[PDB]
Ligand binder design. Sequence first.
Ligand code: NAD
Ligand code: NAD
Lengths: 293, 291
Amino acid sequence: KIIVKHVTVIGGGLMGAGIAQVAAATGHTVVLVDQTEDILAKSKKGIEESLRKVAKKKFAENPKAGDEFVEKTLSTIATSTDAASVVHSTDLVVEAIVENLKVKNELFKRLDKRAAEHTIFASNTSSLQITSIANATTRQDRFAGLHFFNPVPVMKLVEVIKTPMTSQKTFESLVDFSKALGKHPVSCKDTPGFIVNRLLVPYLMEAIRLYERGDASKEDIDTAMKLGAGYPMGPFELLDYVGLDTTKFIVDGWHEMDAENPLHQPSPSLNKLVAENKFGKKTGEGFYKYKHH
Amino acid sequence: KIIVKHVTVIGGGLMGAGIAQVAAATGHTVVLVDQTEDILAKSKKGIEESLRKVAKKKFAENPKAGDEFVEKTLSTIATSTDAASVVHSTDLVVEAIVENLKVKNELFKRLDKRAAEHTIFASNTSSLQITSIANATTRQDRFAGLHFFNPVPVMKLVEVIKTPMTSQKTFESLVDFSKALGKHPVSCKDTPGFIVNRLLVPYLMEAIRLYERGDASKEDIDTAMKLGAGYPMGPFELLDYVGLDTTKFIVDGWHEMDAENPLHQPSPSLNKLVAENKFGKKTGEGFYKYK
Ligand SMILES: NC(=O)c1ccc[n+]([C@@H]2O[C@H](COP(=O)([O-])OP(=O)(O)OC[C@H]3O[C@@H](n4cnc5c(N)ncnc54)[C@H](O)[C@@H]3O)[C@@H](O)[C@H]2O)c1
Ligand SMILES: NC(=O)c1ccc[n+]([C@@H]2O[C@H](COP(=O)([O-])OP(=O)(O)OC[C@H]3O[C@@H](n4cnc5c(N)ncnc54)[C@H](O)[C@@H]3O)[C@@H](O)[C@H]2O)c1
């Protein structure tokens, strides 16, 4: 077996940055990639802030030990603006850039040419077909989905997505990598939503519909699911948390593919908030208003 | 206003006994009704056991008081095999009998003729139209749904289901009672599944379907929802907890009442387990095997 040691993370946004942090804090050598040296600087700055915050809590009894912990993790994270310049010596590429099929394919089609023969390619895409992105290369046996959850340093789950072309060898290596990250990998076919979103999102939509239908208030529904179902967050609270735009985008996709399916019918309230740019906790307001920090 | 103090709980089963216990534990006078003395005898025994299990921990430093707390509570629960003889002056009737609409209606239609004027009637039914029961009486203004969750003494949520005919006075009385029970009432219309089950059951069926499609294993799905969604139990673990037959029954109902809706399509796997009497934990086996 070829064990993942060097990881190239493409995209230093909410997800990528978190993936880089966890990979680096667990002993992997990482190269975080993004479009500009500024974006990278900002992303790395966010990773530091997050680590120091974790350190000031784990090593509360010893600041020096906390600093060392942060410095060692942070120092194993290099940054480059062109992934092509470093994949020839990387073991795994984890992509977390814009959720646009064409962009991702252009990305992987090119990297395919620079990457070492054993290099595995993985996409953290939530709504696109791993199979579609994989066929943008001739490395399908070494391509799969590696789906994380926000905040990455905190959420322990990772969905390892296998296309009909992914090799068992590629699959096992990602499972191993997942455990090496301190996460718990689960397996799922390359089907829309995979496991979590496929069971989570349609439920959140049903919650919105029960509310639009006026059967009960948002507040009551949230109370009902937290106390009655034991959920950490009521559905409206979670919607604002994951992002109403993020959610609408996923559902539009499903609706597009099967407009006749009632489960994916659009939500007026959801569309309205998104139109009004009320994306949730991101913009200080979604279905609920939040204290603009 | 109408302050509920004397309560009639019809049905001393899983839900019934729990409602009786919490009502009694919170200072209400309670009369528990069921079909036989043996059933009632066992129901009241289960209540005593549950109360004692608690007292032993809470009154460790003073067992005497603990036993008195239990004594007081049990002595505030009466039992009867004849509902009609009890409702003449009760403030509230909470029903939790077999999920059969006919039986329920006959029950309430009969009791409507016995209950005092101010008496409020309420059903704990999960998959039935509160309206399809209130109309079985002429007390529609004092009829509502009051849906509790198992274990009643643990679950703090209570869904107060109001119908178009339900009085506001009746509504606020049930809300006040819910709070008196130390519970937290939420409001919903007499729409199927109310809030909780309406949003939970279909999700659980979807989990089964993902499994039946061959997309992932039950274990991973369970793990996925626990770690990825922060749920206490994975869907299959929960299905076995709430009961597979219980669930199937609710899904079939919605399926018959609207066979066009994809969320209510029957599950081969679910039906099979029910057929071969594998109902979940309460049977030692459902999607998983226990003990
Ligand atoms: N945030 C979530 O809830 C979540 C959870 C799981 C998976 N995802 C998936 O992860 C991916 C990124 O999500 P995000 O929330 O981290 O996004 P984001 O907008 O926070 O960050 C994306 C980063 O990608 C960079 N980027 C865009 N195009 C690029 C290109 N051609 N080359 C290099 N870098 C490029 C941007 O500059 C940006 O810093 C998406 O595919 C999304 O569907 C999101
Ligand atoms: N998941 C649950 O267990 C749950 C949760 C919420 C609501 N409910 C609802 O609560 C009610 C009962 O559920 P349960 O789980 O307590 O059931 P159960 O079968 O444990 O207990 C019902 C009790 O009702 C008695 N009963 C039946 N018909 C009667 C009649 N005509 N008169 C007097 N007693 C009668 C039985 O003998 C039995 O002891 C149902 O309407 C159901 O839909 C169940």
